[PDB]
Amino acid sequence: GQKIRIRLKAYDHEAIDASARKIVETVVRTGASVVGPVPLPTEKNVYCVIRSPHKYKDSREHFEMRTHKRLIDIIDPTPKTVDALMRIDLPASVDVNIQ
Amino acid sequence: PRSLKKGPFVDEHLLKKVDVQNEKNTKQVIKTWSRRSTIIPDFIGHTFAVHDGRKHVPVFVTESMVGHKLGEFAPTRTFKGHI
Amino acid sequence: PRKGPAPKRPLVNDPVYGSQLVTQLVNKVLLKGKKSLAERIVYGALEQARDKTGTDPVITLKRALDNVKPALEVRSRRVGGATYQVPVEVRPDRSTTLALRWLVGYSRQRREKTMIERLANEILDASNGLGASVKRREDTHKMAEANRAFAHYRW
Amino acid sequence: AKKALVNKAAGKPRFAVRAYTRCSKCGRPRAVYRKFGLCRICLREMAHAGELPGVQKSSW
Amino acid sequence: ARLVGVDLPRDKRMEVALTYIFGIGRTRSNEILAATGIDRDLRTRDLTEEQLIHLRDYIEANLKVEGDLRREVQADIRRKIEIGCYQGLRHRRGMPVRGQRTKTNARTRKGPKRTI
Amino acid sequence: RPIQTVGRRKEAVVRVRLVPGTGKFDLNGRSLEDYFPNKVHQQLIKAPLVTVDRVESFDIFAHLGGGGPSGQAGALRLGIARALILVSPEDRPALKKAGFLTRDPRATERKKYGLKKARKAPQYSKR
RNA sequence: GGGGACUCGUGAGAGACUGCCGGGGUCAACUCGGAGGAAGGUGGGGAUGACGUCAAGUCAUCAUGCCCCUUAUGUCCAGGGCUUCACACAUGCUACAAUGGCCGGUACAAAGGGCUGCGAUGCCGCGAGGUUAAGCGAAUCCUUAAAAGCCGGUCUCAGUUCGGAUCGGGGUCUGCAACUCGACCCCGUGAAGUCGGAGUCGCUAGUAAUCGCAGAUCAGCAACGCUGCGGUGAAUACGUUCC
Numbered sequence: 116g117q118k119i120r121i122r123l124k125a126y127d128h129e130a131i132d133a134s135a136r137k138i139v140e141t142v143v144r145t146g147a148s149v150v151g152p153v154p155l156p157t158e159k160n161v162y163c164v165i166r167s168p169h170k171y172k173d174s175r176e177h178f179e180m181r182t183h184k185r186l187i188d189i190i191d192p193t194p195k196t197v198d199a200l201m202r203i204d205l206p207a208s209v210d211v212n213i214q
Numbered sequence: 215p216r217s218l219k220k221g222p223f224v225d226e227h228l229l230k231k232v233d234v235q236n237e238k239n240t241k242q243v244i245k246t247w248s249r250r251s252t253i254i255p256d257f258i259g260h261t262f263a264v265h266d267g268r269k270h271v272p273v274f275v276t277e278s279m280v281g282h283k284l285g286e287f288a289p290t291r292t293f294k295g296h297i
Numbered sequence: 298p299r300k301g302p303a304p305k306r307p308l309v310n311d312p313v314y315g316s317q318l319v320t321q322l323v324n325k326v327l328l329k330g331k332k333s334l335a336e337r338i339v340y341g342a343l344e345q346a347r348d349k350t351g352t353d354p355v356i357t358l359k360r361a362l363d364n365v366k367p368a369l370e371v372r373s374r375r376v377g378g379a380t381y382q383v384p385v386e387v388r389p390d391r392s393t394t395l396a397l398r399w400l401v402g403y404s405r406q407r408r409e410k411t412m413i414e415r416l417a418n419e420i421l422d423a424s425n426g427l428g429a430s431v432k433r434r435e436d437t438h439k440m441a442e443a444n445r446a447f448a449h450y451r452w
Numbered sequence: 453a454k455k456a457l458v459n460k461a462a463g464k465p466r467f468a469v470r471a472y473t474r475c476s477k478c479g480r481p482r483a484v485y486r487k488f489g490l491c492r493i494c495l496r497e498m499a500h501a502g503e504l505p506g507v508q509k510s511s512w
Numbered sequence: 513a514r515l516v517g518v519d520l521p522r523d524k525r526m527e528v529a530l531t532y533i534f535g536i537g538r539t540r541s542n543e544i545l546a547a548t549g550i551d552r553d554l555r556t557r558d559l560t561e562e563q564l565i566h567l568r569d570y571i572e573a574n575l576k577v578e579g580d581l582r583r584e585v586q587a588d589i590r591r592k593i594e595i596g597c598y599q600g601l602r603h604r605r606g607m608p609v610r611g612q613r614t615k616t617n618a619r620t621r622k623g624p625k626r627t628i
Numbered sequence: 629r630p631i632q633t634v635g636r637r638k639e640a641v642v643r644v645r646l647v648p649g650t651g652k653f654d655l656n657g658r659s660l661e662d663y664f665p666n667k668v669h670q671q672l673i674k675a676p677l678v679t680v681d682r683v684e685s686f687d688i689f690a691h692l693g694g695g696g697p698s699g700q701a702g703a704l705r706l707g708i709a710r711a712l713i714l715v716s717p718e719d720r721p722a723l724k725k726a727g728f729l730t731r732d733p734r735a736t737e738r739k740k741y742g743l744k745k746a747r748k749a750p751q752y753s754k755r
Numbered sequence: 756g757g758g759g760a761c762u763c764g765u766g767a768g769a770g771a772c773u774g775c776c777g778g779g780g781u782c783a784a785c786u787c788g789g790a791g792g793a794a795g796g797u798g799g800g801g802a803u804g805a806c807g808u809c810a811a812g813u814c815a816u817c818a819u820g821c822c823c824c825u826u827a828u829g830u831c832c833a834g835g836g837c838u839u840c841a842c843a844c845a846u847g848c849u850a851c852a853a854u855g856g857c858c859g860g861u862a863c864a865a866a867g868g869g870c871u872g873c874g875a876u877g878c879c880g881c882g883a884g885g886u887u888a889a890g891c892g893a894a895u896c897c898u899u900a901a902a903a904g905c906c907g908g909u910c911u912c913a914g915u916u917c918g919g920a921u922c923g924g925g926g927u928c929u930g931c932a933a934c935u936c937g938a939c940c941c942c943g944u945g946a947a948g949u950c951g952g953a954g955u956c957g958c959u960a961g962u963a964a965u966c967g968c969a970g971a972u973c974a975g976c977a978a979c980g981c982u983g984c985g986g987u988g989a990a991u992a993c994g995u996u997c998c
């Protein structure tokens with residue numbers, strides 16, 4: 116049917132959409148039905164630390180941690196494709212789920 | 215332990231020290247550090263040397279201190295007055 | 298400021314009573330951002346003003362302000378080892394401000410129960426020249442007209 | 453901190469509520485975040501150094 | 513209108529007039545007036561003596577009011593003092609008993625500032 | 629073809645679907661006096677309509693969402709004035725002169741560290 | 756089911772430069788006023804701290820030179836303390852009420868958290884909670900009912916239906932354990948306080964004032980703190996003499 120659901124996550128911008136575009140281009144050449152990379156909202160994890168190691172409360176930093184999500188593609192689970200879905204080496208800063 | 219679903223709380227090393235004396239009916243003092251233990255109505259008449267931080271303080275369980283913790287009768291701090 | 302005057306904000310016409318004087322009264326009554334509360338007090342007191350005269354209430358309001366607008370204020374100035382007050386001329390849109398503050402202020406400490414019947418009784422007593430808001434008008438005038446000798450140092 | 457207290461917090465204590473956290477770089481008992489395992493100080497050098505991914509300075 | 517020897521404040525609504533009894537606040541006042549059927553929006557000057565019998569006897573069967581509440585309260589404070597507990601010593605000195613901060617506050621148990 | 633505009637004020641985002649008619653408001657399934665019960669807000673809902681004098685036409689309906697109610701009233705005013713241009717290319721200088729096309733960017737300023745609020749500082753106390 | 760219109764999510768870009776007009780200025784820098792534009796002269800806010808000062812702070816984050824301890828100034832454990840209380844200061848919270856209290860009804864957010872978890876629904880309890888268990892590593896499910904606001908009712912200016920300290924009793928949950936010393940709930944109790952002396956603080960706009968919500972640390976929590984988020988939303992600025 117249309118069963119394969121991929122769930123790319125990554126810390127940085129521009130290392131994930133290129134992993135969605137030019138790397139999951141290797142699915143349409145096996146003749147499958149793509150729906151395109153769908154952007155999801157970005158997660159944020161804000162941290163707030165005191166700068167000084169002692170007694171200066173009013174001087175602070177703000178560190179964040181973004182997480183980008185994309186490519187909720189619902190391609191055709193053809194047994195020829197599902198081999199070649201997982202042959203490519205994704206970068207180290209890209210996570211993937213096959214659900 | 216403070217909620218009626220799980221009973222009261224007495225330390226098990228303190229329950230064994232009175233059950234060896236409730237079986238033969240003697241009233242020797244029990245040196246103890248268990249301030250957190252509840253007084254139950256099997257401590258009646260028993261005396262207890264209860265640690266307060268620096269020494270052990272005698273306490274005589276009479277009848278009306280039977281819903282209290284055992285540490286409530288050895289005061290830890292000391293204050294006579296500023297002048 | 299050091300760098301000259303600042304632009305002042307336009308007040309939109311009031312929908313119930315088509316006048317910018319009503320919407321300049323609700324901003325004096327406004328406390329803690331309760332603007333729909335502040336408009337129920339002003340609208341409620343103006344409806345009680347026509348229940349005791351029959352006259353249109355904003356005509357009574359403009360007669361009430363014309364009895365409490367000051368013309369001479371009494372600003373302070375030190376010269377040497379002594380101070381004094383200089384009588385200076387109140388520009389007109391300050392006299393609107395300084396008179397709306399006296400009506401709201403002297404009726405918050407007035408002897409009724411609710412703010413609607415406190416504010417409405419002060420408007421009616423000022424449109425006849427009776428209230429405590431009218432009393433500060435001539436106290437501001439008698440103070441400034443007792444110091445005509447110092448009107449020669451006007452910055 | 454003291455080197456005995458760093459080894460004690462690593463092991464398994466009696467009465468499992470008695471456990472706590474220390475910084476995995478310097479062994480500090482306070483201000484340790486759970487996402488990183490680091491205190492407020494060691495988080496701040498390692499984020500500037502780019503040594504833990506996804507973390508940078510935020511402005512909004 | 514004496515209820516239990518308490519002299520209710522005249523010209524006052526019945527939800528609040530029962531709260532002048534030592535031992536009844538607003539929750540008991542809703543459930544005296546619910547069992548006896550006397551409505552809450554009633555003044556105390558319009559009360560009926562036939563109605564006053566209905567709630568002068570519901571209270572002794574269920575509640576605890578002046579005198580024998582006030583003596584049961586002051587015999588609990590009395591109990592802690594001779595057993596020598598922590599709160600009994602803490603009752604003897606006018607210091608606060610429920611684990612309170614005594615460095616910058618507790619001006620309720622203590623009086624006004626002695627100012628040495 | 630349907631008029632599709634959008635106005636937004638602070639966080640409110642309305643979606644005006646201006647249709648010609650007898651003049652009727654049903655904002656989010658609810659009329660004007662049933663959704664905005666305040667006469668000051670209702671003055672500025674149809675304040676672009678009294679300028680162009682087309683208030684007796686144009687029964688609208690919108691999808692009111694986000695923000696608070698005063699933000700929703702001002703966002704609806706920007707939605708109407710940007711919808712009157714798609715039915716009329718000649719009332720544009722009339723509504724630009726009043727200021728009904730300005731989006732009015734006035735957001736809540738962020739809280740800054742060391743401060744009690746966006747700008748409020750704590751007690752100074754030099755000694 | 757489906758649609759690609761509208762929002763939104765997020766990629767890539769367009770846009771503001773004194774670019775255009777008029778007056779002033781050495782024709783210059785630039786300034787005053789327009790037009791057009793979502794925005795106009797740094798559009799709003801953040802990030803960003805030159806050379807140095809204060810022998811400023813930190814040897815208790817870490818690191819380190821000297822110096823001292825090595826049957827103890829090392830290290831384990833149980834109890835206690837860090838929470839004391841004639842007082843003095845400092846930063847806040849809740850108040851002294853009618854622009855309010857209480858009861859009933861009803862509307863509109865944003866940014867966040869969730870596997871040793873979030874607990875919908877049902878059921879029992881006045882209530883904190885207990886129990887059962889769906890769905891969810893989440894734009895999906897839960898957190899999640901925002902509170903002020905609006906409308907109706909009542910109180911009627913009183914130390915009160917204001918205030919909610921203190922104390923008496925009864926509980927729930929976390930945890931080996933809640934006495935010293937946890938928070939929350941129910942019933943009772945109902946203190947000071949009626950707007951604060953000399954003095955002193957913050958704030959120029961979505962600011963101040965007021966109203967909630969969330970996060971980190973965390974078993975629980977002394978969270979009224981701190982860092983954020985949105986709701987409603989002012990009054991003024993002549994001016995540069997004085998501080």
Ligand SMILES: [Mg+2]
Nearest residue numbers: 469470471472
């Ligand atoms: Mg712990």
Ligand SMILES: [Mg+2]
Nearest residue numbers: 736737745746
């Ligand atoms: Mg705010």
Ligand SMILES: [Mg+2]
Nearest residue numbers: 751752753754
């Ligand atoms: Mg300071």
Ligand SMILES: [Mg+2]
Nearest residue numbers: 797802803804
């Ligand atoms: Mg710069």
Ligand SMILES: [Mg+2]
Nearest residue numbers: 809810811812
């Ligand atoms: Mg020094």
Ligand SMILES: [Mg+2]
Nearest residue numbers: 170811812813
């Ligand atoms: Mg020093």
Ligand SMILES: [Mg+2]
Nearest residue numbers: 814815819822
């Ligand atoms: Mg050393």
Ligand SMILES: [Mg+2]
Nearest residue numbers: 832833834835
């Ligand atoms: Mg120890």
Ligand SMILES: [Mg+2]
Nearest residue numbers: 615836837838
């Ligand atoms: Mg301390």
Ligand SMILES: [Mg+2]
Nearest residue numbers: 856916917918
């Ligand atoms: Mg009350």
Ligand SMILES: [Mg+2]
Nearest residue numbers: 858859860861
């Ligand atoms: Mg309500």
Ligand SMILES: [Mg+2]
Nearest residue numbers: 878879880881
């Ligand atoms: Mg129930």
Ligand SMILES: [Mg+2]
Nearest residue numbers: 905906907908
């Ligand atoms: Mg009301």
Ligand SMILES: [Mg+2]
Nearest residue numbers: 914947948949
């Ligand atoms: Mg008094």
Ligand SMILES: [Mg+2]
Nearest residue numbers: 852912913949
């Ligand atoms: Mg009063």
Ligand SMILES: [Mg+2]
Nearest residue numbers: 972973975976
């Ligand atoms: Mg917590």
